[PDB]
From a paper:
ExoG is an evolutionarily conserved 5′-3′ exonuclease in higher eukaryotes that is localized in mitochondria. Compared to its paralog, endonuclease G (EndoG), ExoG contains an additional Wing domain at the C-terminus and bears a signature SRGH sequence (instead of DRGH in EndoG) in its catalytic ββα-metal motif. Here, we report that human mitochondrial Exonuclease G (ExoG) may participate in this particular process by efficiently cleaving at RNA–DNA junctions to remove the 5′-end RNA dinucleotide in an RNA/DNA hybrid duplex. Crystal structures of human ExoG bound respectively with DNA, RNA/DNA hybrid and RNA–DNA chimeric duplexes uncover the underlying structural mechanism of how ExoG specifically recognizes and cleaves at RNA–DNA junctions of a hybrid duplex with an A-form conformation.
Author numbering:
A (entry chain B): 57 to 360
B (entry chain A): 58 to 357
Write the structure that this text describes.
DNA sequence: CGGGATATCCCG
DNA sequence: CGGGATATCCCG
DNA sequence: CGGGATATCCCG
DNA sequence: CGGGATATCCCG
């Protein structure tokens, strides 16, 4: 009964409850204006479809109280990019699902090079795993880790941007859980990775950012996949699989191929080819056919 | 469809409210400190036999050890163990007081702040029970940003011990008081943000007062959600005083209490002299106890 | 009221 | 050996 | 695949 | 005036 008086006007609300969307769930951090964690499940069929990111717009999540919501004004001009945790490429199968990955509840301030480079390649590896595993679960989120000074003092220091003070993480994390098949008795494979929020080149391999699940849980203050039995056999994902990202040649050729569709003049399309030859990358048959037929499309445009 | 997503469960943040004998809290597993601590104070609870000296700081056995702080994190760190739910609010129950010494109720606090200005704030909260039947208090840590001279805004705080316990830059307290369950007077509310540093006696408590809205935006919390915000709610520093004990009053009480722990006529007489050097005149309550402890020490 | 340091001793 | 319990002292 | 910029419109 | 809305252009 003495509890009733204490609770009479309600406990303070933290707003950390799980929020569910078409193909991802997340816990929001109202103080930092960023997601705490974002859970997604990707399959072979989900990463295919006609949904297009160019038909999507970054906008605040209408389900978040605006007093705790980030806004594009916080990001634009800040020097940081809007970094999706649940990637759009994992939701080509549903335009509603993809549109929800552009809510700012799924966004953190992310280094421009990191977002479009190393982190983009990690996201691609997660999708490649659907060709070798039937089911793949991914948890992603931000981190603010301490730095040891010359005097031994350990300090957490991070920037906040915009009038709403959106927190800029020092690192990003990713936890990958893969089940080979729904009928196989093969053990589950798991990996936890912590990457610094900055430009990471092609030399460092993914394993160099791998950490134990326990250490990440201690760094984040989270417990991932609680229903999972840790006594059971759980193999290291980087031992069952390669944990191998696209190299410079493969990554550059794919981007060059995709950027053919966005070429707006013959000169711009020709510069893509020039880039490949400077990189000593030979185009494949898929690139050339798209290149020549896009060239013909733009040539006809320059006649009118 | 959501079943496959949650097949192995959602990640756990561990922010659910935890209830104890005379307070509740939400724990911050990443920072290893409480996020908020709610308590209800009344005149009956602040009286009793529960003794502070019979308690020990120790890990909260309800917290997973992976996310718990430990005394090894605090000792030698240059920071004191600061309770959010004060032990002084639980003289009525030895169990409730002991629970206020769980490290789940503790944050790294400046020594002077903990024993001084923040201590006086807690005393004022208890003082409100003389004029209000019910007093609710929410206390917790904050790590607030600082605007540099070049415009960039940065959050910077120290972490101590092998477990990296977050040292807050500021502490907050939200005070809600109801005159009585019978009365129809509006409720009194006040929100205060205090820097985790030595303060002194110059500043008045109102100098640290803030809008509830602003504190909620700084902390990311919503306090007292069942409180109707459109209703009539008064500034507690208008209805009441928000006046903390001044130097003379504070020092006299400390000098009075320190008699109990004097184990020599010398250190007992030093209390008197220290009080004299500060130009404070001792009251009868101080003298009466001065004699008994003086006589008691004559005997031995 | 709120917090400490230090010597001594125990024994797994 | 070394962490931990306990007096015993101390500060604002 | 992942992210930007700038111009110009509409109209409450 | 100011926030959406498109259109066009660009980067890795
Ligand atoms: Cl990169
Ligand atoms: Cl102080
Ligand atoms: Mg991204
Ligand atoms: Mg182009
Ligand atoms: Mg205290």
């Amino acid at each position: 009964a003495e509890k009733a008086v204490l609770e009479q006007f309600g406990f303070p609300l933290t707003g950390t409850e799980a929020r569910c969307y078409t193909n991802h769930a997340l816990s929001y951090d109202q103080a930092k204006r960023v997601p705490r964690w974002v859970l997604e499940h990707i399959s072979k069929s989900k990463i295919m479809g006609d949904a297009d990111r160019k038909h999507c717009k970054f906008k605040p999540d209408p389900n978040i109280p605006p007093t705790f919501s980030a806004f594009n004004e916080d990001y634009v001009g800040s020097g940081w990019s809007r970094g999706a945790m649940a990637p759009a490429g994992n939701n080509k199968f549903s335009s509603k699902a993809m549109a929800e990955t552009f809510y700012l509840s799924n966004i953190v301030p992310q280094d421009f090079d990191n977002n479009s480079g190393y982190w983009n390649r990690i996201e691609m590896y997660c999708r490649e795993l659907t060709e070798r595993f039937e089911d793949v679960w991914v948890v992603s989120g931000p981190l603010t880790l301490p730095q040891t000074r010359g005097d031994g003092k350990k300090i957490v220091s991070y920037q906040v941007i915009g009038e709403d003070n959106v927190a800029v993480p020092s690192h990003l994390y990713k936890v990958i859980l893969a089940r080979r098949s729904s009928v196989s008795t093969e053990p589950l494979a798991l990996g936890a990775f912590v990457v610094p929020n900055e430009a990471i080149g092609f030399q460092p391999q993914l394993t160099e950012f791998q950490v134990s699940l326990q250490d990440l849980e201690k760094l984040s203050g989270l417990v991932f996949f609680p229903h999972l039995d840790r006594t059971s056999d759980i193999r290291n994902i980087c031992s069952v699989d390669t944990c191998k990202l696209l190299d410079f040649q493969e990554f550059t050729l794919y981007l060059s191929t995709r950027k053919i569709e966005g070429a707006r003049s013959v000169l711009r399309l020709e510069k893509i080819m020039e880039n490949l030859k400077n990189a000593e990358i030979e185009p494949d048959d898929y690139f050339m056919s798209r290149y020549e037929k896009k060239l013909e499309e733009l040539k006809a445009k320059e006649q009118s």
